[PDB]
Design a binder for this molecule. Structure first.
Ligand SMILES: Cc1ccc(CN2CCCCC2)cc1-c1noc(C)c1-c1ccc2c(c1)OCC(=O)N2
Length: 139
């Protein structure tokens, strides 16, 4: 039923990290955004930009920050060991929490923008660099 496209907003669950706001985008070298068990190429929102391929089973549509609590809770049932379960919590403090909060601010802005608007603003530029307007607003 679900098939993501470039510009779609998703929470991504990665080993060693809590659910993080992302945007589906095209891989700069392969030129694809999906491949086959299905994978999608995503950008991680925040001030320290990263990209990666994620499996669909580890993506959930992004609506807003309010979803995080239920994602943390529901994922606990499928993370039986302590090191996995502890990573579901929002980062305690420091630089990782500030990155996650900035990620959420950016994703919430993207969510009230159109697909093309969020793509023009938030897509990374490749030579991987942030769009200068995004970098200035983040600091
Ligand atoms: C895919 C990936 C690649 C590399 C690095 C390491 N990199 C993190 C940023 C600082 C330098 C070291 C982390 C991930 C990653 N895998 O799962 C999540 C979640 C992340 C991630 C964590 C934090 C941030 C991020 C992605 O991008 C946006 C941001 O501002 N911070």
């Amino acid at each position: 039923l679900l098939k993501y496209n470039v510009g779609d907003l998703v929470w991504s669950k990665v080993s060693g990290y809590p659910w993080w706001p992302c945007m589906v985008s095209a891989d700069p070298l392969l030129h694809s955004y999906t491949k086959l068990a299905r994978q999608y190429h995503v950008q991680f929102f925040g001030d320290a930009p990263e990209r990666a391929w994620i499996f669909e089973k580890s993506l959930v549509a992004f609506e807003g920050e309010g979803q995080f609590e239920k994602l943390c809770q529901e994922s606990a049932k499928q993370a039986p060991t302590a090191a996995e379960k502890i990573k579901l919590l929002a980062p305690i403090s420091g630089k990782l929490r500030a990155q996650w909060e900035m990620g959420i601010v950016q994703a919430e802005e993207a969510a009230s923008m159109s697909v093309e608007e969020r793509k023009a603003k938030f897509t990374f530029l490749y030579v991987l660099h942030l769009n200068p307007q995004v970098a200035k607003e983040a600091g």
